[PDB]
């Protein structure tokens, strides 16, 4: 078939228009850079808009607080797979970057002294663990995410961006390991577009649709990390999928951890406030790995609830009806719509569901995409940048801390623009395009457009979701994994036999979902083989066959004269899957975890310990 192709040149091009999408689009537009923001849906529709319990900063609006305590909660929360330095930049710039958002127009809920309302959340504490449960989570009550994306989008309208609304990012454009831009199908008229740009930013969100039951949006098909895999990058830490504790039993749409830090709790079949046993101190407000686990143990050890005894209860009815309205209005409501549940009088049916993807496109604290060989450290892919869910600076490690995600979005968004001003120097002109670049991205589009196999696209997505659901869930076994891996590769195979019906370009819904189906498969497979190989339990990745966390030392005993296990023998290292996209072979490799802060004088590094809550 015949195709129209189009060319623009920009200083920087952004794939993604969500939280990090825009916050960087803000800095760069304002810095007077010719900016194009390519997004595959009107930016409001983006997933950030769906966020709830708030965004963390040590604002001190409920009690004195120190950004350093927040730091500590982040290192711990990450079960030390977190990059000490990357986590630093996040924790340090928090109070500013949240503050900034207020200045921007964000109608935060308010304290009687006219300050930003903060609220407790999963797995935070005052004074480096010692003190009580912390209150750092600033929020627009129950729909923080909604308000963040909406301010950002607004405030981005005064920063001179060229918005490319509903355009589908096919592939990055390469030239000798340097990203010179991006290629997308225009949804509206059906053209194809090439953007030559000096830098390119990937902030595409996560891939929570690789599982069967999740809290992610239908557009969370993990397309960026697909481009990254396709561009010959390894991805990082894919095996760490974070299971949110409280997802509505039926559909699985989120009920905030807010409901917990606000004073609510989980309950089993007996009536027991069970979290007390699985964690004595921080209880219903332990990290979301510990808790989602606890639930699944309670479920499987009989004490489940309802008709099939297969989920637990989130009980909020014991809480003052006033504060329940003025602090949780949307969940209060989506509970009535979906569970058909009155929150003031009954509990919500909840079950851990696939939520956030710590894993993604690897970077340094400067938010630049890296390829790591063992011989010559991490070398930077020229002029490629990533942030938000889809990146892995690993600030989250093995377990993203509740509400460090919109912080991570905005902070490293901001960071992109700050860091690109300092390094792109405008002597360097807009790159030329390699003889017919991404003529193959346009090819793979023709093949899927007129796809004619025996297996529909609908049908492939379902089993891939289901197999992921069984073989990669909360608790996993060396064989039950190996067993998924096989079923999994069998699908990347089944991809040739793909079947679509719609032959159009003008808003081909079908065609684009099939492109997505491609992109997920890349994520999925990788996830499961990365998981299949990690023989330790850490953060959100728990093997029944290796319950232990496999560090250098055993951090249960003094350490004085213990021989440091070599890099090849322990598990404190980032998984790093390198997938060949046409066969779908995946080789592994393991990058060391960064343990130095940004400046050891400002804050001293935090050494590992036995992770209890």
């Amino acid at each position: 078939a015949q195709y129209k192709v189009i060319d623009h040149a920009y200083d920087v091009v952004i794939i993604g228009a969500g939280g990090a999408g825009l916050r960087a689009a803000m800095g760069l537009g304002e810095a007077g850079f010719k900016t194009a923001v390519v997004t595959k849906m009107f930016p409001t529709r983006s997933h950030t808009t769906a966020a709830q319990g708030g965004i963390n900063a040590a604002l001190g609006s409920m009690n004195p607080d120190d950004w350093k305590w927040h730091f500590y909660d982040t290192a711990k929360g990450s079960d030390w797979l977190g990059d000490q330095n990357a986590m630093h930049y996040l924790t340090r710039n928090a109070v500013e970057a949240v503050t900034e958002l207020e200045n921007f127009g964000m109608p935060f809920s308010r304290t009687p002294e006219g300050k930003i309302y903060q609220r407790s959340f999963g797995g935070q504490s005052n004074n480096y663990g010692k003190g009580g449960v912390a209150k750092r989570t600033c929020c627009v009550a129950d729909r923080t995410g909604h308000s963040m994306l909406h301010t950002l989008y607004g405030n981005s309208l005064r920063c001179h961006c060229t918005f490319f609304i509903e355009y589908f990012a096919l592939d990055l454009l390469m030239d000798k390991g340097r990203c010179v831009g991006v290629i997308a199908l225009c949804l509206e008229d059906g053209t194809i577009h090439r953007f030559r740009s000096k830098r390119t930013i990937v902030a595409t969100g996560g891939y929570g649709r690789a599982y069967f039951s999740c809290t992610t949006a239908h557009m969370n098909t993990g397309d960026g990390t697909a481009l990254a895999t396709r561009a010959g990058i390894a991805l990082e830490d894919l095996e760490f999928i974070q299971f949110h504790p409280t997802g509505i039993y039926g559909v699985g749409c989120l009920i905030t951890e807010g409901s917990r830090g606000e004073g609510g709790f989980l309950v089993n079949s007996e009536g027991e406030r069970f979290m007390e046993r699985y964690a004595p101190k921080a209880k219903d407000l332990a990290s979301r790995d510990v808790v989602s686990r606890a639930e699944t143990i309670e479920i499987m050890e009989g004490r489940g609830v309802g008709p099939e005894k297969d989920h637990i209860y989130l009980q909020l009815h014991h809480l003052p009806a006033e504060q329940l309205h003025q602090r949780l209005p949307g969940i209060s409501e989506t509970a009535k719509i979906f569970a058909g549940v009155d929150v003031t009088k009954e509990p919500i049916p909840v079950i851990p569901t696939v939520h956030y993807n710590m894993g993604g496109i690897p970077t340094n604290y400067k938010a630049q995409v890296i390829k790591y060989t063992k011989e010559g450290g991490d070398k930077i892919v020229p002029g490629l940048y990533a942030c938000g869910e889809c990146a892995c600076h690993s600030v989250h490690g093995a377990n993203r801390l509740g509400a460090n995600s919109l912080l991570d979005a905005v902070v490293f968004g901001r960071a992109c623009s700050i860091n690109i001003k300092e390094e792109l120097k405008p002597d360097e002109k807009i790159p030329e395009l390699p003889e017919g670049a991404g003529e193959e991205s346009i090819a793979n589009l023709d093949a899927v457009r007129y796809a004619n196999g025996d297996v529909p696209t609908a049908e492939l997505r379902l089993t891939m979701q289901k197999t992921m659901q069984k073989h990669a869930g909360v608790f996993r076994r060396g064989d039950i994994l190996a067993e998924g891996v096989k079923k999994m590769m069998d699908l990347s195979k089944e991809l040739k036999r793909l079947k679509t019906t719609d032959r159009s370009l003008i808003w081909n819904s079908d065609l684009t979902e099939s492109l997505e189906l491609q992109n997920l498969m890349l994520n999925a497979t990788q996830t499961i083989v990365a998981a299949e190989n990690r023989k330790e339990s850490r953060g959100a990745h728990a093997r029944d066959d290796f319950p232990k966390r496999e560090d250098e030392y055993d951090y249960s005993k003094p350490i004085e004269g213990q021989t440091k296990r070599p890099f090849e023998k322990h598990w404190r290292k980032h998984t790093l899957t390198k997938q060949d996209p046409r066969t779908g072979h995946i080789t592994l490799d393991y990058r060391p975890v960064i343990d130095k802060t940004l400046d050891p004088a400002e804050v001293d590094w935090i050494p590992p310990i036995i992770r209890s809550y």
Partner: protein, 129 residues
């Protein structure tokens, strides 16, 4: 493929620049206030006309009515009579109509007040049969 033409930006509205030239001061605020208040003050009138009669009532009843209707049709005419449907120069025509209308309505009433039964009485002179 390698046959591509160079593309322009998407039509997009520029909240800053394309909103720092144009600024013209003329408020329809002030004026809307008055058309509401009149329509309001026009309440007692309709009751009162059911009782008190004569040339005097006839007068202000059919003088105010002219105005209320003048504004009203304007509103209407302005709504439907839209250029995207009638082409620029027909839309201009109907807008003139709304005043031509408003003129004959007056003339018509003012005659009928001075020369036929009058208004107020022309209702008595029905409400009995």
């Amino acid at each position: 493929t390698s046959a591509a033409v160079t593309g322009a930006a998407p039509p997009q509205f520029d909240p800053i620049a394309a909103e720092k030239g144009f600024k013209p001061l003329h408020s329809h605020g002030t004026l809307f206030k008055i058309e509401r208040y009149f329509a309001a003050a026009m309440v007692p009138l309709i009751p009162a006309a059911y009782f008190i009669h004569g040339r005097e009532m006839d007068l202000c009843l059919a003088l105010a009515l002219t105005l209320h209707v003048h504004w009203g049709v304007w509103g209407v005419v302005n709504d439907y009579g839209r250029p995207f449907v009638l082409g620029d120069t027909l839309a201009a025509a109907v807008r003139v109509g709304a005043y031509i209308f408003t003129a004959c309505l007056l003339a018509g009433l003012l005659y009928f007040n001075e020369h036929d039964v009058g208004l107020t009485r022309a209702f008595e002179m029905v409400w009995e049969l």
